[PDB]
Enzyme design. Structure first.
Site, PDB file in Angstrom:
ATOM      1  N   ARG A  30       0.867  -1.204   0.000  1.00  0.00           N
ATOM      2  CA  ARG A  30       0.000   0.000   0.000  1.00  0.00           C
ATOM      3  C   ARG A  30       0.894   1.240   0.000  1.00  0.00           C
ATOM      4  O   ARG A  30       2.017   1.151   0.524  1.00  0.00           O
ATOM      5  CB  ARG A  30      -0.921  -0.024   1.223  1.00  0.00           C
ATOM      6  N   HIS A  31       0.401   2.345  -0.564  1.00  0.00           N
ATOM      7  CA  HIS A  31       1.061   3.679  -0.568  1.00  0.00           C
ATOM      8  C   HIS A  31       1.268   4.175   0.870  1.00  0.00           C
ATOM      9  O   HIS A  31       0.707   3.573   1.799  1.00  0.00           O
ATOM     10  CB  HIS A  31       0.232   4.682  -1.382  1.00  0.00           C
ATOM     11  N   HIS A  44      -2.706   0.364  -3.822  1.00  0.00           N
ATOM     12  CA  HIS A  44      -3.690   0.731  -2.774  1.00  0.00           C
ATOM     13  C   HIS A  44      -3.950  -0.472  -1.866  1.00  0.00           C
ATOM     14  O   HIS A  44      -3.509  -1.584  -2.207  1.00  0.00           O
ATOM     15  CB  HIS A  44      -4.974   1.247  -3.437  1.00  0.00           C
TER      16      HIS A  44
END
Ligand SMILES: O=C(N[C@@H](Cc1cc(=O)[nH]c2ccccc12)C(=O)O)c1ccc(Cl)cc1
Lengths: 257, 256
Positions: free
Chosen positions: A8-9, A194
């Site tokens: 995930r970012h 994401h």
């Protein structure tokens, strides 16, 4: 071995400083005036001015440091990254770049911006997709993007407010296409996207049937910033399985108050 | 102007990873084995073994960054810190050090460790104070401490499970003793202590100290590296709060 890593970012500016964050760091004339040390020193200039950040916000200073540490942890464990893809979300490109900085691979590895790795488009506001910075302009902002890469799903082929099934289907189609074109070139693939990507990209890779939409959303919300999962190919079966990731997890608390 | 800067320490290991945090990063034989990237690469060897951390917890990796950034922000504001004092808590000395790193002043300056700046001792568990690392041992961990420094209120003179009246007084007295000795040396003084310290030290230097119930409320509202600024109103000796010389620092958790 041959592994696929999905993470995930980093921490989002529009989460820490809320939905009206541009209010707190842009003045009447549109000059960036940071009002917190978690805000970056400067923000890159966009093709549509600062209002393009409203639907495509950057990661925070602590978001960069989360990403740096995961990169530094991959290097320390002698975990070689051969290919890196990312969602066209600015927060994902920035995370990917900061992981390359920690990896000491800014000047070797070139990030493959894949719109097919953008999250479930149901989570975009209004009836318009975000004004994603094109690869050519990401490169012109120091971010180590490959401007040569041919996307498997261009921006123009992404549906506005797509169904759960559309999102799950394209997430699977694009992951096989990513795996397929990296069969020759290298062993380990890193995808930077994401929370939804960690499940949607891997779920059907193991032969399994995808979760129903409501179970999916619950799984997705338990994935932290730089949350890192791992998939190893089982022999030449074509099926992959989830495994203990090569690096430790990363857990920190809030500022407080 | 002549300023006093009082700021809380960075993120605690024992908050993030719970009260049983030694259970997660020490094995049978007392070998440090980190289980999370927020845990440091290694921990200093303590005088009385690893169990001394149980009541004197170190800051996290992100704890150090909080401090670094505050330091870096001080540098950029053109704010020269002339004298720096801190609590004898490891978390406070580690915060103080990483602010000096942030200031690019690890070598030039040396941290004045003052047991008088330690938080309200009612918040101690058992019937014993924390086994703090002496300024000698701290400077032996590369932490830029001033071994010279003569403490205004030494450890031996600290009361276990003290009263709210005793804390505010010993916090008031030590601050004046800190202001007194610096008068000539330089201009700006930096305290690096606890959430309690920001109120207790600058309350009556400006006012009547609040009641115990009103105090606890204000304390729990102060974040890691939370930062307040006081300035001497001429040479009158009455100081007043002011918009600090640096921006505040706000970030969320890992989440999930
Ligand atoms: O937390 C946000 N996004 C999520 C995805 C996500 C988005 C959404 O609309 N509804 C959801 C419901 C359940 C689960 C996930 C979502 C992510 O980052 O993974 C987020 C989005 C916008 C802003 Cl200004 C600030 C934060």
């Amino acid at each position: 071995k041959r592994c696929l890593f999905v993470c995930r970012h980093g921490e989002r500016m529009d989460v820490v400083f809320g939905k009206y964050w541009l209010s707190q760091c842009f003045d009447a004339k549109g000059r960036y005036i940071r009002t917190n040390l978690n805000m970056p020193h400067s923000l890159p200039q966009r093709s549509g001015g600062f209002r393009d950040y409203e639907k495509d916000a950057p990661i925070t200073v602590f978001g960069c440091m989360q990403a740096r540490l995961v990169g530094e942890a991959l290097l320390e464990s002698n975990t070689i990254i051969d290919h890196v893809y990312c969602s066209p979300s600015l927060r994902c490109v920035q995370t990917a770049h900061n992981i390359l900085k920690g990896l000491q691979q800014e000047n070797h590895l070139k990030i493959r911006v894949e719109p097919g790795l953008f999250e479930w488009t149901k989570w975009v506001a209004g009836s318009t997709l975000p004004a994603w910075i094109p690869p050519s302009e990401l490169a012109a902002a120091n971010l180590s993007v490959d401007t040569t890469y041919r996307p498997h799903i261009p921006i123009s082929k992404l549906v506005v407010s797509e169904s759960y099934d559309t999102y799950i289907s394209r997430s699977f189609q694009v992951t096989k296409e990513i795996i397929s074109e990296c069969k020759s070139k290298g062993n380990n693939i890193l995808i930077v996207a994401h929370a939804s990507s960690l499940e949607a990209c891997t779920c059907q890779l193991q032969g399994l049937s995808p979760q129903n939409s409501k179970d999916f959303v619950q799984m997705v919300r338990k994935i932290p910033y730089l949350g890192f999962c791992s998939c190893e190919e089982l022999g030449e079966t074509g099926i992959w399985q989830l495994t203990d990731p090569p690096i430790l997890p990363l857990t920190h608390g809030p500022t407080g108050g």
